[PDB]
mmCIF file of C-alpha atoms in Angstrom:
data_model
loop_
_atom_site.group_PDB
_atom_site.id
_atom_site.type_symbol
_atom_site.label_atom_id
_atom_site.label_comp_id
_atom_site.label_asym_id
_atom_site.label_seq_id
_atom_site.Cartn_x
_atom_site.Cartn_y
_atom_site.Cartn_z
ATOM 1 C CA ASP A 220 29.419 -13.746 87.416
ATOM 2 C CA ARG A 221 28.425 -12.887 83.872
ATOM 3 C CA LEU A 222 26.966 -10.036 84.855
ATOM 4 C CA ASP A 223 30.387 -8.536 86.180
ATOM 5 C CA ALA A 224 32.749 -8.862 83.681
ATOM 6 C CA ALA A 225 30.181 -6.806 81.002
ATOM 7 C CA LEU A 226 30.584 -3.874 83.711
ATOM 8 C CA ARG A 227 33.868 -4.664 84.338
ATOM 9 C CA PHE A 228 35.852 -2.437 82.058
ATOM 10 C CA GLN A 229 33.472 0.435 83.601
ATOM 11 C CA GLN A 230 34.014 -0.108 87.256
ATOM 12 C CA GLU A 231 37.339 0.387 86.751
ATOM 13 C CA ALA A 232 37.343 2.686 84.575
ATOM 14 C CA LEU A 233 34.733 4.878 86.642
ATOM 15 C CA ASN A 234 37.399 3.910 89.714
ATOM 16 C CA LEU A 235 40.499 4.730 87.888
ATOM 17 C CA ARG A 236 39.103 8.578 87.264
ATOM 18 C CA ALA A 237 38.402 8.811 90.843
ATOM 19 C CA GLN A 238 41.903 7.807 92.369
ATOM 20 C CA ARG A 239 43.583 9.797 88.978
ATOM 21 C CA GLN A 240 41.109 13.105 90.495
ATOM 22 C CA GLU A 241 42.030 12.801 93.932
ATOM 23 C CA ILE A 242 45.255 12.103 93.012
ATOM 24 C CA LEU A 243 45.579 15.822 90.771
ATOM 25 C CA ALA A 244 43.380 17.266 93.892
ATOM 26 C CA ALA A 245 46.186 16.751 96.507
ATOM 27 C CA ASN A 246 48.772 18.104 93.828
ATOM 28 C CA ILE A 247 46.220 21.454 93.572
ATOM 29 C CA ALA A 248 46.443 21.255 97.697
ATOM 30 C CA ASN A 249 49.960 21.037 98.135
ATOM 31 C CA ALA A 250 51.100 23.637 95.227
ATOM 32 C CA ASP A 251 52.290 26.036 97.820
ATOM 33 C CA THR A 252 54.189 23.182 100.121
ATOM 34 C CA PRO A 253 58.370 23.745 99.340
ATOM 35 C CA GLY A 254 59.556 20.961 97.917
ATOM 36 C CA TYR A 255 56.473 18.453 97.402
ATOM 37 C CA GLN A 256 56.635 16.761 93.673
ATOM 38 C CA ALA A 257 53.618 16.445 91.492
ATOM 39 C CA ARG A 258 52.767 12.842 90.976
ATOM 40 C CA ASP A 259 50.174 11.583 88.615
ATOM 41 C CA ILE A 260 49.668 8.101 87.543
ATOM 42 C CA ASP A 261 49.676 6.721 84.308
ATOM 43 C CA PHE A 262 46.063 5.799 83.253
ATOM 44 C CA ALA A 263 45.825 3.590 80.421
ATOM 45 C CA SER A 264 48.432 0.995 81.610
ATOM 46 C CA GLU A 265 46.916 1.160 85.520
ATOM 47 C CA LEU A 266 43.920 0.480 83.153
ATOM 48 C CA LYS A 267 44.685 -2.523 82.360
ATOM 49 C CA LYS A 268 46.548 -3.656 85.214
ATOM 50 C CA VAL A 269 43.830 -3.521 86.765
ATOM 51 C CA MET A 270 41.304 -5.438 84.147
ATOM 52 C CA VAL A 271 43.821 -8.221 83.576
ATOM 53 C CA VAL A 272 48.651 1.480 91.880
ATOM 54 C CA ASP A 273 51.915 3.421 91.248
ATOM 55 C CA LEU A 274 52.596 6.602 91.398
ATOM 56 C CA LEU A 275 54.467 8.704 88.719
ATOM 57 C CA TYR A 276 56.441 11.478 88.889
ATOM 58 C CA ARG A 277 55.730 14.394 86.337
ATOM 59 C CA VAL A 278 58.349 16.765 84.621
ATOM 60 C CA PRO A 279 58.616 19.296 85.563
ATOM 61 C CA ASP A 280 57.869 23.046 82.751
ATOM 62 C CA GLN A 281 59.823 25.693 84.668
ATOM 63 C CA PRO A 282 61.967 25.391 87.995
ATOM 64 C CA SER A 283 60.772 27.186 90.810
ATOM 65 C CA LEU A 284 63.013 28.022 94.177
ATOM 66 C CA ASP A 285 61.574 25.956 96.773
ATOM 67 C CA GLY A 286 61.253 22.258 95.113
ATOM 68 C CA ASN A 287 57.862 22.838 94.428
ATOM 69 C CA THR A 288 57.175 21.147 90.604
ATOM 70 C CA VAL A 289 53.247 21.763 91.035
ATOM 71 C CA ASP A 290 51.775 23.646 87.911
ATOM 72 C CA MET A 291 48.604 25.003 88.263
ATOM 73 C CA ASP A 292 47.930 25.327 84.127
ATOM 74 C CA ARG A 293 48.127 21.470 83.249
ATOM 75 C CA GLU A 294 46.980 19.849 86.672
ATOM 76 C CA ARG A 295 43.486 22.328 86.087
ATOM 77 C CA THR A 296 43.437 21.062 82.798
ATOM 78 C CA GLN A 297 44.027 17.847 83.775
ATOM 79 C CA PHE A 298 41.556 18.628 86.490
ATOM 80 C CA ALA A 299 38.882 20.079 84.280
ATOM 81 C CA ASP A 300 39.285 16.880 81.654
ATOM 82 C CA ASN A 301 39.102 14.058 84.767
ATOM 83 C CA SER A 302 36.107 15.487 85.463
ATOM 84 C CA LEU A 303 34.429 15.574 82.183
ATOM 85 C CA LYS A 304 35.712 11.615 81.574
ATOM 86 C CA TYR A 305 34.568 10.854 85.062
ATOM 87 C CA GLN A 306 30.835 11.615 83.534
ATOM 88 C CA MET A 307 31.366 10.375 80.361
ATOM 89 C CA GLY A 308 32.076 7.150 82.012
ATOM 90 C CA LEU A 309 28.864 8.088 84.457
ATOM 91 C CA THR A 310 26.642 7.945 81.088
ATOM 92 C CA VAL A 311 27.977 4.575 79.844
ATOM 93 C CA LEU A 312 27.696 3.168 82.864
ATOM 94 C CA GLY A 313 24.100 4.386 83.482
ATOM 95 C CA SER A 314 23.020 3.270 79.993
ATOM 96 C CA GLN A 315 23.965 -0.188 80.655
ATOM 97 C CA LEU A 316 22.237 -0.939 83.146
ATOM 98 C CA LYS A 317 19.159 1.513 81.602
ATOM 99 C CA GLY A 318 19.542 -0.722 78.996
ATOM 100 C CA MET A 319 20.426 -4.052 80.793
ATOM 101 C CA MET A 320 16.657 -2.810 82.387
ATOM 102 C CA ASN A 321 14.632 -2.816 79.918
ATOM 103 C CA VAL A 322 15.392 -5.798 78.413
ATOM 104 C CA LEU A 323 13.752 -7.267 82.092
ATOM 105 C CA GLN A 324 10.741 -4.690 82.607
ATOM 106 C CA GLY A 325 7.336 -6.415 81.000
ATOM 107 C CA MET B 93 98.924 66.984 106.435
ATOM 108 C CA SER B 94 97.987 68.123 109.657
ATOM 109 C CA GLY B 95 94.981 70.918 110.636
ATOM 110 C CA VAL B 96 92.732 69.237 107.605
ATOM 111 C CA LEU B 97 89.761 66.686 108.313
ATOM 112 C CA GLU B 98 88.591 64.559 105.668
ATOM 113 C CA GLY B 99 84.464 65.316 104.202
ATOM 114 C CA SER B 100 82.495 61.822 102.960
ATOM 115 C CA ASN B 101 82.563 60.601 99.964
ATOM 116 C CA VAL B 102 79.167 60.690 98.939
ATOM 117 C CA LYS B 103 78.854 61.662 95.410
ATOM 118 C CA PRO B 104 74.825 63.413 95.037
ATOM 119 C CA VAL B 105 74.504 62.869 91.354
ATOM 120 C CA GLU B 106 75.032 58.797 91.593
ATOM 121 C CA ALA B 107 72.633 59.097 94.713
ATOM 122 C CA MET B 108 69.818 61.091 92.679
ATOM 123 C CA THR B 109 70.412 58.736 89.377
ATOM 124 C CA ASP B 110 70.098 55.408 92.072
ATOM 125 C CA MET B 111 66.984 56.725 93.256
ATOM 126 C CA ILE B 112 65.275 56.745 90.211
ATOM 127 C CA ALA B 113 66.390 53.700 88.604
ATOM 128 C CA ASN B 114 65.083 52.549 92.058
ATOM 129 C CA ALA B 115 61.079 54.178 91.852
ATOM 130 C CA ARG B 116 61.040 52.903 88.617
ATOM 131 C CA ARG B 117 62.436 49.885 88.831
ATOM 132 C CA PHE B 118 59.876 49.337 91.747
ATOM 133 C CA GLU B 119 56.882 50.331 89.655
ATOM 134 C CA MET B 120 57.602 47.593 87.088
ATOM 135 C CA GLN B 121 58.148 44.738 89.735
ATOM 136 C CA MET B 122 54.154 45.664 91.614
ATOM 137 C CA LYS B 123 53.116 45.938 87.391
ATOM 138 C CA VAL B 124 54.476 42.844 86.237
ATOM 139 C CA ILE B 125 52.757 41.599 89.934
ATOM 140 C CA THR B 126 49.547 42.701 89.271
ATOM 141 C CA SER B 127 49.629 41.153 85.570
ATOM 142 C CA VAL B 128 50.145 37.931 87.027
ATOM 143 C CA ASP B 129 47.820 38.097 89.763
ATOM 144 C CA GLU B 130 44.650 39.290 87.683
ATOM 145 C CA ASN B 131 45.841 36.284 84.920
ATOM 146 C CA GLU B 132 45.925 33.573 88.100
ATOM 147 C CA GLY B 133 42.212 34.993 89.524
ATOM 148 C CA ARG B 134 40.894 34.718 85.365
ATOM 149 C CA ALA B 135 42.233 31.194 85.020
ATOM 150 C CA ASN B 136 40.908 30.079 88.366
ATOM 151 C CA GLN B 137 37.774 29.140 87.056
ATOM 152 C CA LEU B 138 38.525 26.520 84.670
ATOM 153 C CA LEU B 139 38.067 24.232 87.445
ATOM 154 C CA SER B 140 34.295 24.726 87.195
ATOM 155 C CA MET B 141 34.269 21.639 85.410
#
């Protein structure tokens, strides 16, 4: 359907933002697990792949003794950024749907 | 030598200096712990969108 092609990009971006949000929250929740590696996804490459998931390990900053590589500050900033981008995607998708609607209303 | 008993070799000057140093080090580490805890408490609000 042509309607899907117009809204495909924003829907895929929104779904990818939700998945990465879940991954970041999993990183936050498992901060205290000894031996847990902080995982993340490269948003742009996966968005290419879906439009046309694989988890990448985060490069550790400080060496802990229990093997936990989760850094609070980095993932807190990433979490806030992902929340903001999810809201922006919701706004853009809603604007596109509302425009398609006011075209029809009459 | 017979008729003499050997006592301990605990130097009291070293013990007193060790106690003073240990007390000061403990207080420094407690201060560092408090600073780190307060910093994390302030930092854990960013997550609010």
